[PDB]
Amino acid sequence: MKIAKVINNNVISVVNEQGKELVVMGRGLAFQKKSGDDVDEARIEKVFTLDNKDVSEKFKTLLYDIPIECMEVSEEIISYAKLQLGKKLNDSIYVSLTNHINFAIQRNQKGLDIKNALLWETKRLYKDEFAIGKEALVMVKNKTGVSLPEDEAGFIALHIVNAELNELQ
Amino acid sequence: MKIAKVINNNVISVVNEQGKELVVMGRGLAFQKKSGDDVDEARIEKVFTLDNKDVSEKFKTLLYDIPIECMEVSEEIISYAKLQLGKKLNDSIYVSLTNHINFAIQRNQKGLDIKNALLWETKRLYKDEFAIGKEALVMVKNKTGVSLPEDEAGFIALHIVNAELNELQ
């Protein structure tokens, strides 16, 4: 990607090929470089990505209202899953668990649980991915303490199967 | 949220409680205003949120890969679903469908088919959420041409129920 705009020597503005402007803070990113030049990845300290407030209505509350701690947790949870599967999983699961863990905490406080009505079938039909979900759950309860029931783990397994881009082992 | 850092009159830097530094651009955001003061909502024209090269492993590819068109579509999908349900669904579904749609396109192109073997149970067990999922899918396929089968739609329904705040109506 290339630098399109320059705010200062350290902070530059990039337009990704995916049509998204990024603001990258680095140290001397515009120094000894030019606009239209490919963004140096060594001097990158911090990156900022564009929220287009007109289009990104609800998208805003993800990047605003999700605790960074929960973010790390979810990233590491699915990194665990990705480590076990070997496949670069669909990005959808990562963001779903950040809100889902936070909502699970609230659900736990409410004294309510959700049920997976497909669980009896799911447990048998999807053994490995459910097991990885269980292992992930172990990681969840050991890192945060949040314990989700098998139903909820089943929903995670459903997201895992949607996250698996082609079974090939 | 507060304006903590100021690069110029139109571009400011917020430090959110969720440990997120934000670069918000808007005409006169720092104009007359002060550090520690709240970002003027009417002067918010463009927002940028922090992406960390170390922390955001997968979280990075979300905000990089997602096209603005697909974002609009997904916001509209959930808008349809949210209008039908009258429930402000969990934030996960919005971002999950942007990736799910892009990955579904890729899935369709690669010739990856995933038949939901749970769908046959889902028919009776998940009537409304799946029906609305289908209606939303109709909307997607008419607007974009991107057509998914009942199986994939069923998986979308699983995402919907994970984003559902239960039947609290």
Q: CA quadruple A144, B55, A152, A100: dihedral positive or negative?
A: positive
Which of the listed residues A11, A42, A62 is the one where a domain comes to its end?
A: A62
Distance CA B133, CA B158 (A): 10
Answer yes or no: do A68 and A28 share one domain.
no
* 3-state secondary structure at position A132: helix
Domain interval for residue B9: 2-64
Q: Give the list of residues 6+ apart from residue B108 with CB closer than 8 angstroms, or none.
A: B146, B148
Residue B169 lies in a domain: no
A80 within 8 A of A143, measured Cβ to Cβ:
no
Same domain, yes or no: A37 and A56: yes
- Residues of chain B with C-beta less than 8 angstroms from the C-beta of A157: none
CB contact under 8 Å between A118 and B114, yes or no, is: no
Tell me if B80 sits within 8 A of B72, measured CB to CB: no
Chain discontinuities in chain B, listed by preceding residue (C to N exceeding 2.5 Å): none
- Contact residues on chain B for A7, CB-CB shorter than 8 A: 7-8, 11
Nearest to B155 by CA among B127, B122, B106: B122
Residues 6+ apart with CB under 8 A from A83: none
Q: Is B147 helix (H, G, I), strand (E, B) or coil?
A: coil
In a domain, A168, yes or no: no
Which H, E and C letters describe A27-87, residue by residue?
Answer: CCCCCCCCCCCECCCCCEEEEEEEECCCCCCCHHHHHHHCCHHHHHHHHHHHHHHHHHHCC
Contact A99 B92 (CB under 8 A): yes
Q: Which helix (H) or strand (E) holds A2?
A: strand A2-6
In 3D space, the residue among B164, B126, B111, B143 whose CA is nearest the CA of residue B153 turns out to be B126
Q: Are residues B139 and B151 in the same domain?
A: yes
> In B52-87, which positions are buried (b, 16+ CB within 10 angstroms) versus exposed (e)?
beeebebbbebbbbbebebbbbbbbbbbbbbeebeb
Residue (of B31, B24, B136, B12) closest to B77 by Cα position = B136
Residues B114 and B36 in one domain: no
Residue where a domain stops, chosen among B14, B31, B64: B64
Contact A60, A40 (CB under 8 A): no
**Are residues A80 and A13 part of one domain?**
no
Nearest-by-Cβ selection for B94 from A59, A162, A166: A59
The domain that holds B12 is classified in CATH as 2.30.24.10
A152 and A95 both lie in a single domain: yes
Rg (CA), chain A: 20
Q: What distance in Å separates residue B23's CA from the closest CA in chain A? A: 7
Kindly state whether residue B116 falls inside one of the protein's structural domains.
yes
- Please, which residues bridge with residue A48 across strands? A23, B50
In a domain, B168, yes or no: no
Q: What is the DSSP letter of B2?
A: B
Number of domains in chain A: 2
Residue B104 lies in a domain: yes
* End-of-domain residue from the set A22, A42, A62: A62
Q: Are strands A11-15 and A21-26 parallel, antiparallel or unpaired?
A: antiparallel
- 3-class DSSP state for residue B11? strand
Are A118 and A156 contacting, i.e. CB atoms less than 8 angstroms apart? no
The alpha-carbon gap from A59 to the nearest alpha carbon of chain B, in Å, equals 7
Are A48 and B95 inside 8 Å of each other by CB?
no
Distance between CA atoms of residues B94 and B79, nearest Å: 9
What's the token pair of residue A162?
């949607």
Token pair in block for residue B127: 């009537």
Indicate if B138 and B88 belong to the same structural domain: yes
For residues A49, A52, A55, A58, the Cα torsion angle rounded to the nearest 10 degrees is: 60
Cβ-proximal residues to A167 (8 Å cutoff; 6+ apart), any chain: none
Looking at the fold, whether B158 and B121 belong to one and the same domain comes out as yes
Task: Please answer yes or no on whether A95 and B96 come within 8 Å at the CB atom.
Answer: yes
| Cβ–Cβ below 8 Å for A78 and B58 | yes
Experimental method: NMR
Interface touch B90/A103, C-beta < 8 Å:
yes
A71 and A57 part of one domain: no
Is residue A48 a contact partner of residue B21, using CB atoms and an 8 Å limit?
yes
Alpha-carbon distance A49 to nearest alpha carbon in chain B (angstroms): 5
Co-location of A92 and A58 in the same domain: no
Q: What is the CATH number of the domain that holds B129?
A: 1.10.1790.10
